[PDB]
Amino acid sequence: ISHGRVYRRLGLGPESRIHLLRNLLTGLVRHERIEATWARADEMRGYAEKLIDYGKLGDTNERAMRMADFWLTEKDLIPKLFKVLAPRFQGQNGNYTRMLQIPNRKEQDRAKMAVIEYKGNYLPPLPLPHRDSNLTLLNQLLLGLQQDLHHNQ
Amino acid sequence: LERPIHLACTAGIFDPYVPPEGDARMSLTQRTERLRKNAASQLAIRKIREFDANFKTKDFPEKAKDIFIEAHLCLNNSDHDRLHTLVTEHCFPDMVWDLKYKTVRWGFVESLEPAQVVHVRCSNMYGQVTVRLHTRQTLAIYDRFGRLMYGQEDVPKDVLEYVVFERHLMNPYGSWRMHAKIVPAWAPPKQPILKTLMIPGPQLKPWEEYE
Amino acid sequence: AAPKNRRTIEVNRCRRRNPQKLIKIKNNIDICPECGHLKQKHVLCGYCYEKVRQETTKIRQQIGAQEGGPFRAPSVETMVLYTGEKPSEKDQGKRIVERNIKRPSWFT
Amino acid sequence: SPTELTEMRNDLFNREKSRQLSLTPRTEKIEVKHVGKTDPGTVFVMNKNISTPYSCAMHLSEWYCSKSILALVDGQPWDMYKPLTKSCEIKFLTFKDPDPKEVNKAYWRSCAMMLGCVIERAFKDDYVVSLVRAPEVPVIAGAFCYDVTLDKRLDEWMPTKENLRSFTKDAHALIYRDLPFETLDVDARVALEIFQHNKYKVDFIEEKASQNPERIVKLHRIGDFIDVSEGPLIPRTSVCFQYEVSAVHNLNPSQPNLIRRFQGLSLPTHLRAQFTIWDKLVERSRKMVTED
Amino acid sequence: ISRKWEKKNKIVYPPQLPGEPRRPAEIYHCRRQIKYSKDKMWYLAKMIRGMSIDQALAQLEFNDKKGAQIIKEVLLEAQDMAVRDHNVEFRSNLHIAESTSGRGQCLKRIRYHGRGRFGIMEKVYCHYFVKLVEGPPPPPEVPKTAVDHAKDYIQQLRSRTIIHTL
Ligand SMILES: [Mg+2]
Ligand SMILES: [Mg+2]
Ligand SMILES: [Mg+2]
Ligand SMILES: [Zn+2]
Numbered sequence: 021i022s023h024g025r026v027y028r029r030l031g032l033g034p035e036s037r038i039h040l041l042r043n044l045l046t047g048l049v050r051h052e053r054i055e056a057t058w059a060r061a062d063e064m065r066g067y068a069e070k071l072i073d074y075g076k077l078g079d080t081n082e083r084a085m086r087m088a089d090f091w092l093t094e095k096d097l098i099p100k101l102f103k104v105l106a107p108r109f110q111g112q113n114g115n116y117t118r119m120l121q122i123p124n125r126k127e128q129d130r131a132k133m134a135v136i137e138y139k140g141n142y143l144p145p146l147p148l149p150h151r152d153s154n155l156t157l158l159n160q161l162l163l164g165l166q167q168d169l170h171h172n173q
Numbered sequence: 174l175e176r177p178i179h180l181a182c183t184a185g186i187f188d189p190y191v192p193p194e195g196d197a198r199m200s201l202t203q204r205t206e207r208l209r210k211n212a213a214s215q216l217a218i219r220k221i222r223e224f225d226a227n228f229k230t231k232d233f234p235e236k237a238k239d240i241f242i243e244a245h246l247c248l249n250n251s252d253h254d255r256l257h258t259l260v261t262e263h264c265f266p267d268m269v270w271d272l273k274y275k276t277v278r279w280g281f282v283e284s285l286e287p288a289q290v291v292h293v294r295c296s297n298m299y300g301q302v303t304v305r306l307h308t309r310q311t312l313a314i315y316d317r318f319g320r321l322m323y324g325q326e327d328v329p330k331d332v333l334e335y336v337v338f339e340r341h342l343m344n345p346y347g348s349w350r351m352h353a354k355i356v357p358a359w360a361p362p363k364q365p366i367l368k369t370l371m372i373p374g375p376q377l378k379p380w381e382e383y384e
Numbered sequence: 385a386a387p388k389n390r391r392t393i394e395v396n397r398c399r400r401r402n403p404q405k406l407i408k409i410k411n412n413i414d415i416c417p418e419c420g421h422l423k424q425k426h427v428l429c430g431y432c433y434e435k436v437r438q439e440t441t442k443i444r445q446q447i448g449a450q451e452g453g454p455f456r457a458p459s460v461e462t463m464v465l466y467t468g469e470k471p472s473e474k475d476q477g478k479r480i481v482e483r484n485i486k487r488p489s490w491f492t
Numbered sequence: 493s494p495t496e497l498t499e500m501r502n503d504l505f506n507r508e509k510s511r512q513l514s515l516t517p518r519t520e521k522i523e524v525k526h527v528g529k530t531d532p533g534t535v536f537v538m539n540k541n542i543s544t545p546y547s548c549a550m551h552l553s554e555w556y557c558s559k560s561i562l563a564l565v566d567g568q569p570w571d572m573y574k575p576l577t578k579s580c581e582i583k584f585l586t587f588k589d590p591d592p593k594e595v596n597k598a599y600w601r602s603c604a605m606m607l608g609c610v611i612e613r614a615f616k617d618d619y620v621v622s623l624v625r626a627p628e629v630p631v632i633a634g635a636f637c638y639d640v641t642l643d644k645r646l647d648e649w650m651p652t653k654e655n656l657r658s659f660t661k662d663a664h665a666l667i668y669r670d671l672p673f674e675t676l677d678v679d680a681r682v683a684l685e686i687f688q689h690n691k692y693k694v695d696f697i698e699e700k701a702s703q704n705p706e707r708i709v710k711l712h713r714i715g716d717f718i719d720v721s722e723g724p725l726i727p728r729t730s731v732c733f734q735y736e737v738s739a740v741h742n743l744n745p746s747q748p749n750l751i752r753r754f755q756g757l758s759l760p761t762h763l764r765a766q767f768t769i770w771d772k773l774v775e776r777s778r779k780m781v782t783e784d
Numbered sequence: 785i786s787r788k789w790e791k792k793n794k795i796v797y798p799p800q801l802p803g804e805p806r807r808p809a810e811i812y813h814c815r816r817q818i819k820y821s822k823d824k825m826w827y828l829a830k831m832i833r834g835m836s837i838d839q840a841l842a843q844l845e846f847n848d849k850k851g852a853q854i855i856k857e858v859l860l861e862a863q864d865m866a867v868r869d870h871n872v873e874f875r876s877n878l879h880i881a882e883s884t885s886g887r888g889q890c891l892k893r894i895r896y897h898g899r900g901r902f903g904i905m906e907k908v909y910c911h912y913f914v915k916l917v918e919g920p921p922p923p924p925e926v927p928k929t930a931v932d933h934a935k936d937y938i939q940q941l942r943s944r945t946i947i948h949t950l
Contacts (some may be wrong), residue, residue, distance in 0.1 A: 041483070049670040092750050099459040100458070100459060122428055124848060128850075130848040137434075143464075144439050144440055145490070145492075146436060147428055148428075149428075154589065155595050156763060157631065158763040159629065161773050164634045165443055165776050241531070274794060275798055300708040313799075315799045316871045317796050318797050318807040318808075319800035320800060320807060364518075368873045369543055369873065370549075371534060372535040373535060374531065374534040379431060380435070383532045407827050409831065409843060413842045417529075418530075550873075550876050551874050551875060552875075552876070553838050554836055554876045
């Protein structure tokens, strides 16, 4: 009976879970694109989004600095969070991270894998799933339906 | 190797005779040409006479023709034992290597024109005689499963080929055996395989890009 | 508790060939438009993804040389330029990573 | 009798096939190069006038066979089952291409032809049904249209809902048969002979023959049914999955000969539609279509 | 040990006469000493039975089992020799007629236990066999209709005879 609980049980315990997640978050901020097991990447996605919000609060905020200090073990990253990532995501209200499933791991444990990144990074674009064009057969028929309904009141 | 390896034939042709463009006609001339190159080739004939003494260009084409017909007919029966006597060790793998697990039906239709010796050479000592053959033949090759993959069951097509025979003059038990065929550049292309082929393009790893 | 009788191959064949124990056939396998290799509908193409990361490693390798040591992350945005490209006015005051190869067609 | 026309028309169709098949003696090899994005550079050594683009797809893999609806031979759309004629570069088109304009037309034309086949055999042999034309309508119109002239006896009978439902049942039967769309490029003379009785078809053949420098006219056959075509068609009738004969509308200026336009919608297996989406599209396919 | 599966590719039939259906090609291939349980390999071999070559490869590429890659590699080798050596025209025109696993020669080792007791462990090997038959996969299985079931029942009734009498 684990109804309503919003966390995975990871690592050696609750504290170990935080540290495992913290290490992934630290890697994500530095490199902006990280591969982990799909479950662990999903666990860390929420923290990645909330960290940007703390960065938006501002450099001078004391709580933001303490939060940034705890989560970014490599302390050179803290300037990056407040002066690079937060300015980038000023317009958005959320959805800063992009997470997609990668083919399973070829390492005899066949782990389910994911790629987690921050949006807007400098790295080569991921091969995202592109929806079909309006020129396809089904789309054109729907486009015809849309035009008639809009034009005819 | 303590014992020297024994070779009864030599791979290749000592001097590859170049057929004259247009020779495939009127199906003299080439008869004169062997006379014309007598210095290069008659001397070879003279040496062949010494070790043989019964080598007459007049009668060799008949014997040379006979070997050609019989050698191929072994392919139908697949009598490799006979065929080894008829052809040299250089010729044998070329004829038979790709016919394994296949059945070939080959027959000889009447010869269009008389066979003629066209070029001979000598080198312990080997003597090679090139002969010119124009003949109509039939060929059909099948799969393991009996399905036809090449040729037409029974239609005669005229063939002009130049076949090199060879003999080991020194050996007492040597004989004239089919050795090689010289293909002229001007020859028309042979019939294509019945089936259709895919020639794969370059395979590229993720790093690479097509060009 | 230990077995009271040997289990016959007739019983055993019913256990290990029951449909519940068989490998399910997958209906979500599709071919990738760009590379022409196989993929699952909900999963990224592994061939195309393989291209992206190996280019990423090349970029990150160049980054390591420029920084030269740990704890040298910039406080300014980063940008990658390939041979034949020069920083624009908007590119002013941003770390530039230089790559010997030409700009990949897919990368823009 | 109508059965006789099917027999005689089929005989002429087969006679032309053998004549062209016999026309090519021996085997001549044509090199056709794959120019598509995937598997680039592959060269298919095919036989002239016998092999088809489907055979090239067979060499590569089953994905090409299942997903390829059309081929681009030297920049022109070709039927998958139309024998290749000369050395060229070939590319395979699918329904999910970024701009599948040519594929959409071929699917639309084929579905219209399937409508004609159903109509001919639907009515009782007592009445006389004559196929006039299949107007070329944009896919945006929302339905494919086939024009037909029924007997004067039915000059004021209109199909009911059950009658229209009956038509779709025949169409689905055609799909289940999985009949390949045979292709012939034939000179006017033979096409006119096959379609001598139908005045409407005859004039259409004349137009489509004058258009080309020679008298070549495209003929396509589904089973026994035969028809003239505006261009390339789908490989097989199994491509269609959802099919509907939406409605029939009488063309008002048809006093000399009452022409009734038949309308329907279809979608391939590759692009299926959800239940609700299909219903809404079907409703919009029951409205008149004006060729533009 | 016996190695008859390899020999089957050497059978040569006589030329077919003009009035006869074209014989489909058959290719036999195997990989012998595979470090993998035959019981485990059966499931992978079972799944691809009857499928086309491309369909079998697609399913194997996305299976997480160790044996899937082994079977896939064998299937690709079988495909190449079919076209290269057995006069198969189209690579795609192939289906899995037979696919099964057999026991290999195994090695006996010692499994240590708690109190100086031991057990005999087996280092298991297995073989994998396939036959590829040219042509589309045979049509799938069609279940009996209700009318077919009724017809069989009536035949049983009509077969009844008066038993143990003249
Ligand atoms: Mg939960
Ligand atoms: Mg122990
Ligand atoms: Mg045991
Ligand atoms: Zn891809």
